[PDB]
């Protein structure tokens, strides 16, 4: 499909923009002052597949901790770029702690959390000046939870002058886009390079996000950071995130993504990285790991045996991945089918790299295996699972041989 | 947004089509012969919100059980329409067991599982004849796991004659659409009403599904049953389902949906109904239950307290829903915010019906609550959670009073 062309912005060693794979990022939830906790969580997130990690730089204690966090990450060869999240006092922290400024790989600015009235433009310029001095890229990140009140008022008035005014909600979305686009144009006029600017403008409802990002994509040339903000907890958060991003990503809009889930108490922060990966992979945009295609099962197959086989295949693939990723470049693209009966079993299996079709009700007790679209063997008896996994291993060795 | 206009097809008492809410359906996985197990699961699915329930009618024993299943459902006032899923021997079962034919509310036919060569058209006509006799609606449901081989061959040849032939994969998608569209046109020519025909053409990859359904929507006037077939297990299944459907639903394509997840061993079959609901609600197309908007939390808030509050609010809303749904019509639209700090807390809360913003790091220990966009109160001390839930209850009573 189409991918929107953009200049390349390097965030540390990671390039983002239309010429590069869409990058997965995340954000810590440890207090940034706590150097031990924050370093450990940055590493955890990076190991799960966060190519870029953001951390809040909220107060002086946080700022003073950043250089030590960066130092520890580098000591273990962990080249993970760090993004500093600034609100209200970004200009003061970057001025007062130049070592923190230099240790970050990117600054995030929010045009609605710069200061009130006259403070705004001066605080903005000071942060942009510092980024230009140190050669750092910046994300200008608008969020409708912190929308600039004076800009909203300006656009509400323009709207009230229209022959047919739009709803309050539509004007809020207009204002959000305008906040980002105006600050983008200001930073460029100040001399920040096109290769140093990423944009976002996040809302918490899927259909609104699609409208906003279509506007941003039309009105600017910058790489876009895409996310549904405040997506929430559990299945609701996951579904909403996937639903909001998909229409945009299929249209070629978006260069980096973050999934904004509320973790359940005791649930790992890495869940959001796993979801981000699954969105990109489901849309054919990146490949992170082999995936199992399996039917829901119905009354045509025995539910327990089928469900346990599919689960067993999935678990084994996950167990082998670290090894396979090292020996068999390209293996991330592998598609394995596990199907419940003859209705769609063979056909789906033939569309996979390798697939097995169980015998359902009414059929003789044997399971055909297909690979590269043709019959490979027919399994029977116990250890169907072990025999199929051995076939998958052998197929991987042969196809993804260096 | 846009909704594609279509005639209305009644599936039992449930209308589907462009004038009606998008209907959620599911499918049993019990052996249909087992009357007790199947009835119980139909009820379970319906209670979770499956407006229509499909069951496989695969052999003579299944067919003989359907009338008794329908009888038991009606005895408890459970008006849930049943869809019969037929493959290979549909024509024989419908002819041989007219009581089963009459007990179903809809027949599903697959144009790739009718029989080979010459059998196809005669088996198709016999099933359509029976549906016309009994006034039953039919879904003509194509699936790329069971694609008609002779049609594929026909389209592969047409493709090989093109000045620039398309890939094998693109021709498969062409053939899938063609299978559904041709059978649609055949059924109409036989005299089945436009008010009796629903179409589907499912594939297991998201970007392919979007292409297919855009073609179906253009080429036919029928209500469309939308689903990503064989979506698989766990988070992968959920994400893929949401990602595939969203672009279509936002464009106004789709009149009923089914989510095709593989259950984990021991996991309830109702999970797919919950996911379907969440997709529709995330896109603003239906409202099933109040939803909590919450931030991911970062280093600006204390992670445990915030995460436990958000979880507590969610659990309480879920506890009250059966009652609230009965007393407060419209309450399904309720949006509650639970936010971690002052950065986006107030703003997001003001966009909700009612929201609370916790104090983060550096702030005085108090939590503003907003309702209908303005400050309602400020909470402090212990029992913030209980006090906020009491405010949510009071807000619901006042706004959603009959
Ligand atoms: C981190 C904080 C600052 O706006 C937000 O509340 C949550 O993060 P998010 O959903 O990734 O949204 P942002 O890109 O930070 O605007
Ligand atoms: C039930 C069976 C018949 O094609 C499939 O394997 C799975 O169900 P599904 O994903 O809902 O797809 P269908 O609408 O049944 O084609
Ligand atoms: S492949 Fe067979 S068992 Fe699986 S859902 Fe389809 S028809 Fe049912
Ligand atoms: S609202 Fe505050 S605590 Fe929550 S994610 Fe945003 S900045 Fe962090």
Residues 15-74 of B with CB under 8 A from A: 27-32, 38, 55-56, 58-59, 62
CA B240 – CA B326 distance, rounded (Å) = 34
Contact at CB, B299 and A232, closer than 8 angstroms: no
Q: Do A296 and B263 touch (CB under 8 A)?
A: yes
Fold designation for B287-402:
Sulfite Reductase Hemoprotein; domain 1 (3.30.413)
Contacts of A226 in chain B (CB under 8 A): none
HEC sequence for chain A: CCCCCCCCEEECCEEECCCCCCEEEEECCCCCCCHHHHHHHHHHHHHHCCCEEEEECCCHHHHHHHHHHHHHHHHCCCCCCEEEECCCCHHHHHHHCHHHHHHCCEEEECCCCCCCCCHHHHHHHHHHHHHHHHCCCEEEEEEHHHCCHHHHHHHHHHHHCCCCCCCHHHHHHHHHHHHHHHHHHHHHHHCCCHHHEEEEEECCCHHHHHHHHHHHHHHCCCCEEECCCCEEEHHHHHHHHHHHHHHHHHCCCCCEEECCEECCCCCCCCHHHHHHHHHHHHCCCCCCCCEEEECCCCCCCCHHHHHHHHHHHHHHHHHHHHHHHHHCCCHHHCEEEEECCCCCHHHHHHHCCEEEECCCCCCCCEEEEEECCEEEEEEECCCHHHHHHHHHHHHHHHHCCC
C-alpha B63 chain-centroid distance: 26
Residues of B in contact with A250 (CB under 8 A): 206-207, 210, 247
Tokens of residue B363, six digits = 């702030």
Q: Which residues make Cβ contacts (< 8 Å) with residue B212, sequence separation at least 6?
A: B173, B176, B177, B201, B202, B203
> In terms of C-beta distances under 8 Å and separation of at least 24 residues, what long-range contacts does B210-217 make, across chains too?
B210/A250, B210/B244, B210/B247, B210/B248, B211/B173, B212/B173, B212/B176, B212/B177, B213/B248, B213/B253, B213/B254, B214/B248, B214/B251, B214/B253, B215/B177, B216/B177, B216/B180, B216/B181, B217/B4, B217/B253
Residue A47: how many CB atoms within 10 A of its CB? 12
Asked whether A82 and A104 are in contact (CB, 8 A), the reply is yes
Those residues whose C-beta lies under 8 Å from the C-beta of residue A195, and which sit 6 or more positions away, are A7, A8, A9, A10, A137
* 8 A C-beta contact, residue B263 and residue B23: no
Instruction: Give the other-Cβ count within 10 Å of B302's Cβ.
Output: 17
Distance CA B74, CA B69 (A): 9
CB-side exposure of A154: number of CA atoms within 13 Å? 11
CA gap B86, B93 in Å, rounded: 9
Within 8 A by CB and 6+ apart from B250, the residues are A206, A207, A210, A247, B1, B283
Query: Which of A207, A238, A282 is opposite residue B283, by nearest beta carbon?
Result: A207
Yes or no: is domain A1-286 CATH 3.20.20.80? Answer: no
SS3 for chain B, per residue? CCCCCCCCEEECCEEECCCCCCEEEEECCCCCCCHHHHHHHHHHHHHHCCCEEEEECCCHHHHHHHHHHHHHHHHCCCCCCEEEECCCCHHHHHHHCHHHHHHCCEEEECCCCCCCCCHHHHHHHHHHHHHHHHCCCEEEEEEHHHCCHHHHHHHHHHHHCCCCCCCHHHHHHHHHHHHHHHHHHHHHHHCCCHHHEEEEEECCCHHHHHHHHHHHHHHCCCCEEECCCCEEEHHHHHHHHHHHHHHHHHCCCCCEEECCEECCCCCCCCHHHHHHHHHHHHCCCCCCCCEEEECCCCCCCCHHHHHHHHHHHHHHHHHHHHHHHHHCCCHHHCEEEEECCCCCHHHHHHHCCEEEECCCCCCCCEEEEEECCEEEEEEECCCHHHHHHHHHHHHHHHHCCC
Dihedral of CA atoms B69, B74, B76, B82 in degrees, nearest 10, equals 60
The answer to whether residues A24 and A50 touch, using CB atoms and an 8 Å cutoff, is yes
Q: State the residue for tokens 């064989």.
A: B230
**Interchain CB distance below 8 Å, A244 and B296:** no
CA B308 vs CA A301, B312, B376, B384: distances in Å: 41, 6, 23, 12
**Chain B interface includes A232 (CB < 8 A):** yes
B159-168 in b/e form (b: 16+ CB < 10 A) is beeeeeeeee
Distance CA B297, CA B340 (A): 6
A201 — phi, psi (to 5°)?
-155, 90
Task: State the Cα–Cα distance between residues B321 and B400, nearest whole angstrom.
Answer: 13
Query: Hey, CA dihedral for B125, B130, B136, B138, is it positive or negative?
Result: negative
| Residue A345 CB–ligand 3 contact under 6 Å | yes
Closest CA to A354 of A364, A368, A340: A368
Q: Between the CA of residue A386 and those of A67, A107, A233, A332, what are the distances in Å?
A: 50, 50, 37, 22
The neighbouring-strand residues paired with A14 are A11
CB nearest B294 (choices: A233, A239, A345): A233
Q: How far is Cα A239 from Cα B240, in angstroms, rounded to an integer?
A: 9
CB of B299 less than 8 A from some CB of A = yes
**Cα–Cα distance, B54 to B57 (Å, whole number):** 9
Closest ligand 1 atom to residue A142 Cα is 16
Ligand 2 contact via B178 beta carbon (within 6 Å):
no
Q: In units of Å, what resolution does this entry have?
A: 1.8
- By C-alpha distance, the chain B residue nearest A339 is B230
To 5 degrees, how large is the angle CA A335–CA A338–CA A340? 150
Residue A374: count other Cβ atoms within 10 Å of its Cβ: 7
Question: The sheet that has B23-27: what strands, in order across it?
Answer: B197-202, B138-143, B106-109, B82-85, B52-56, B23-27, B256-258, B225-226
Assigned token pair, A18: 């239309």
Distance CA A151, CA A356 (A): 59
Neighbour count for residue B45 (Cβ, 10 Å): 25
B141 lines ligand 2 (CB under 6 A): yes
Q: Find, in chain B, the residue whose alpha carbon is nearest to that of A207.
A: B283
Number of the ligand 4 atom closest to the C-alpha atom of A87: 7
CA distance B111 to B352: 47
Cβ burial of B305 (10 Å; 0-12, 13-18, 19+) is middle
Q: Give how far A146 is from chain B: nearest CA, Å.
A: 5
A38 contacts B282? CB cut-off 8 A = no
Among the listed residues B339, B330, B351, B274, the one whose alpha carbon sits nearest the alpha carbon of residue B301 = B339
Report the alpha-carbon distance of residue A180 to residue A110 in Å, rounded.
9
Q: Indicate which of B282, B315, B368 best probes the interface with A, i.e. most A CBs within 10 Å of its own CB.
A: B282
Count of C-beta atoms within a 10 Å radius of residue A120: 18
A251 annotated to bind ligand: no
Joined together, the tokens standing for residue A100 give: 């923190």
Look up tokens 């939390």; give the residue. B297
Interface check for B391 against chain A (CB to CB < 8 A): the answer is no
Q: In chain B, whose CA is at the least distance from the CA of A28?
A: B298
Contact B236 A307 (CB under 8 A): no
First-residue to last-residue Cα distance in chain A: 28
Round to whole Å and give the CA distance between A309 and B265. Answer: 10
Task: Please say whether the beta carbons of B222 and B253 come within 8 A.
Answer: no
Ranges for all domains in chain B classified under CATH 3.30.413.10? 287-402
Residues 6+ apart with CB under 8 A from B188: B194, B197
Sign of CA dihedral B252, B258, B262, B263: positive
| CA B308, B313, B317, B319 torsion-angle sign | positive
Q: Which atom of ligand 4 is nearest to B306's Cα?
A: 3
C-alpha span between A119 and B209 (Å, rounded): 50
Cβ neighbours of residue A281 under 8 Å, at least 6 residues apart?
A287, A288, A289, A291
- Closest-approaching ligand to the CA atom of B257: 2
The answer to whether A351 contacts chain B (CB < 8 Å) is yes
Residues in chain B: 402
C-alpha A263/C-alpha A141 separation (Å) is 23
CA A109/CA B52 separation, integer angstroms: 49
CATH 3.20.20.20 domain extents, chain A: 1-286
Atom of ligand 4 nearest to the CA of A27: 5
Q: Chain B within 8 Å of A378 (Cβ-Cβ)?
A: no
Distance to chain B for A112, nearest Cα, Å: 9
- C-alpha to C-alpha distance for A269 and A336, rounded to whole angstroms: 28
The structure was resolved experimentally with X-ray
Residue of B148, B155, B152, B142 whose CA lies nearest to B117: B148
Q: Give the atom of ligand 3 at the shortest distance from the alpha carbon of A342.
A: 2
Phi-psi category of residue A350: left, alpha or beta, with phi > 0 → left and psi -120 to 50 → alpha = alpha
Q: Phi first, then psi: what are they for B233, rounded to 5°?
A: -100, 155
Q: Is the dihedral of CA A142, A148, A153, A158 positive or negative?
A: negative
Chain A residue with minimal CA distance to B34? A299
Mutate to test the interface with A, among B90, B242, B268, B340 (most CBs of A within 10 A): B242
* Ligand 2 pocket test, candidate residues B54, B114, B206, B229, most atoms within 8 A of CB: B229
CA dist., res. B87 & res. B62, Å (int):
13
The contacts found for A265-273 with CB under 8 angstroms, 24 or more apart, are A265/B304, A265/B307, A265/B308, A265/B311, A268/A44, A269/A26, A269/A28, A269/A29, A269/A41, A269/A44, A269/A45, A270/A26, A270/A44, A270/A45, A270/A48, A272/A26, A272/B296, A273/A24, A273/A26, A273/A45, A273/A48, A273/A49, A273/A50
The position carrying tokens 């005669």 is: B122
d(CA B360, CA B306): 9
Tokens standing for residue B156: 């592969």
Question: Hey, is the C-beta of A77 within 8 angstroms of any chain B C-beta?
Answer: no
Directed axis angle between helix B303-327 and helix B384-399, to 10°?
30
Count of CB atoms situated within 10 Å of the CB of B226:
25
- The two structure tokens encoding residue A1: 């499909």
Asked if A209 has any chain B CB less than 8 Å from its own CB, the reply is no
**What residues are paired with A357 via a beta bridge?**
A339
Q: Is A314 at the interface with chain B, CB within 8 A?
A: yes
> How far is it, in rounded angstroms, from Cα A297 to Cα B230?
9
Question: In sequence order, what are the residues at sequence separation of 6 or more whose Cβ sits closer than 8 angstroms to the Cβ of residue B375?
Answer: B368, B369
Choose among A238, A244, A254: nearest CA to A286: A254
B337 to chain A: which residues are within 8 Å by CB? 230
CB A85 within 8 A of CB B297: no
Nearest-Cα distance to chain B for A295, in Å, is: 4
């Amino acid at each position: 499909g189409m991918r929107r062309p953009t200049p390349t912005v390097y965030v540390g060693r990671v390039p983002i923009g239309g010429a590069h794979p869409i990058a997965v990022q995340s954000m810590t939830n440890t207090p940034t002052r706590d150097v031990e906790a924050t370093t450990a969580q940055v590493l955890e997130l990076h190991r799960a597949g966060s190519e870029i990690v953001r951390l809040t730089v909220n107060d002086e204690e946080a700022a003073k901790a950043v250089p030590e966090i960066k130092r520890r990450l580098l000591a273990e060869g962990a080249e993970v770029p760090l993004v500093g999240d600034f609100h209200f006092n970004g200009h003061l922290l970057l001025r007062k702690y130049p070592k923190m400024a230099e240790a970050l790989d990117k600054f995030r600015i929010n045009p609605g959390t710069l200061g009130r009235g006259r403070h705004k433009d001066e605080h903005f310029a000071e942060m942009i000046r510092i980024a230009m001095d140190l050669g750092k890229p910046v994300r200008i990140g608008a969020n409708w939870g912190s929308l600039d009140p004076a800009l909203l008022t300006e656009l509400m008035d323009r709207n009230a002058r229209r022959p047919e005014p739009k709803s309050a909600h539509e004007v809020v979305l207009e204002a959000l886009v305008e906040s980002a686009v105006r600050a983008y144009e200001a930073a460029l006029e100040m001399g920040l390079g096109e290769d140093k600017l990423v944009l976002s403008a996040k809302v918490s409802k899927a259909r609104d996000l699609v409208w906003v990002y279509r506007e941003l994509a039309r009105r600017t040339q910058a790489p876009l950071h895409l996310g549904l903000t405040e997506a929430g907890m559990g299945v609701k958060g996951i579904v909403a995130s996937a639903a909001a991003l998909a229409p945009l990503l299929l249209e070629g809009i978006g260069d980096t993504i973050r999934v904004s889930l509320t973790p359940a108490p005791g649930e790992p922060r890495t869940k959001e990285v796993e979801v981000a990966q699954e969105i990109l992979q489901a849309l054919g945009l990146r490949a992170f790991a082999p995936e199992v295609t399996s039917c829901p099962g119905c009354g045509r197959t025995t539910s327990t045996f089928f469900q346990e086989l599919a689960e067993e295949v999935s678990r084994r693939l996950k167990e082998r991945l670290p090894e396979w990723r090292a020996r068999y470049p390209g293996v991330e693209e592998l598609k394995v089918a596990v199907m419940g009966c003859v209705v769609n079993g063979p056909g789906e299996s033939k569309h996979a790299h390798i697939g097995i079709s169980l015998p359902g009700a009414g059929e003789e007790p044997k399971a055909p295996v297909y690979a590269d679209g043709k019959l490979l063997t027919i399994l029977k008896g116990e250890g169907i699972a072990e025999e199929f996994l051995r076939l998958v291993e052998d197929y991987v060795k042969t196809r993804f041989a260096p």
